[PDB]
Enzyme design. Structure first.
Site, PDB file in Angstrom:
ATOM      1  N   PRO A   1      -0.837   6.451   2.465  1.00 34.26           N
ATOM      2  CA  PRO A   1      -1.501   6.997   1.277  1.00 34.26           C
ATOM      3  C   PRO A   1      -1.406   6.057   0.080  1.00 34.26           C
ATOM      4  CG  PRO A   1       0.615   8.061   1.592  1.00 34.26           C
ATOM      5  CD  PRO A   1       0.389   7.201   2.804  1.00 34.26           C
ATOM      6  N   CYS A   2      -0.350   5.251   0.051  1.00 33.74           N
ATOM      7  CA  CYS A   2      -0.138   4.307  -1.040  1.00 33.74           C
ATOM      8  C   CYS A   2      -1.087   3.114  -0.924  1.00 33.74           C
ATOM      9  CB  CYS A   2       1.312   3.818  -1.044  1.00 33.74           C
ATOM     10  SG  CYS A   2       1.811   3.001  -2.578  1.00 33.74           S
ATOM     11  N   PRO A   3      -1.716   2.709  -2.044  1.00 38.54           N
ATOM     12  CA  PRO A   3      -2.652   1.579  -2.061  1.00 38.54           C
ATOM     13  C   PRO A   3      -1.986   0.270  -1.644  1.00 38.54           C
ATOM     14  CG  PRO A   3      -2.798   2.843  -4.097  1.00 38.54           C
ATOM     15  CD  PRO A   3      -1.575   3.323  -3.375  1.00 38.54           C
ATOM     16  N   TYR A   4      -2.000  -0.008  -0.344  1.00 36.47           N
ATOM     17  CA  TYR A   4      -1.400  -1.232   0.182  1.00 36.47           C
ATOM     18  C   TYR A   4      -2.255  -1.841   1.302  1.00 36.47           C
ATOM     19  CZ  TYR A   4       2.141  -4.519   1.829  1.00 36.47           C
ATOM     20  OH  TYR A   4       2.819  -5.657   2.195  1.00 36.47           O
TER      21      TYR A   4
END
Length: 97
Positions: A36-39
């Site tokens: 879910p984290c922008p990576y």
């Protein structure tokens, strides 16, 4: 006229084929887990401006939900082609130009 009295400095690499020498279409590949984290998909979004005359993506991630991570990114900015597919305990999506 000279026959063998000629010293070449460069090599002639002529390869008459029906396809290109290489493939610069496959943009990025996110084959891990739908975080879910922008990576991961960070490449997808950055790919939009870096777009070329032929883009492609391949994402193979696993998530308990149904929402697509990487595809969601490209879908936001709005790319050319955004498609997805599922199998069993995992999911795989792909995009192209």
């Amino acid at each position: 006229m000279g026959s063998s009295h000629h010293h070449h400095h460069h090599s002639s690499g002529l390869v008459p084929r029906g396809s290109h020498m290489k493939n610069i279409v496959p943009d990025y590949r996110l084959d891990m887990v739908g975080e879910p984290c922008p990576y991961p998909a960070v490449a997808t979004l950055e790919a939009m401006p870096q777009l070329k005359k032929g883009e492609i993506l391949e994402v193979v991630s696993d998530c308990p939900q149904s929402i697509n991570n990487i595809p969601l990114d490209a879908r936001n900015h709005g790319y050319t082609v955004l498609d997805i597919q599922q199998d069993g305990p995992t999911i795989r999506y792909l995009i192209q130009k």
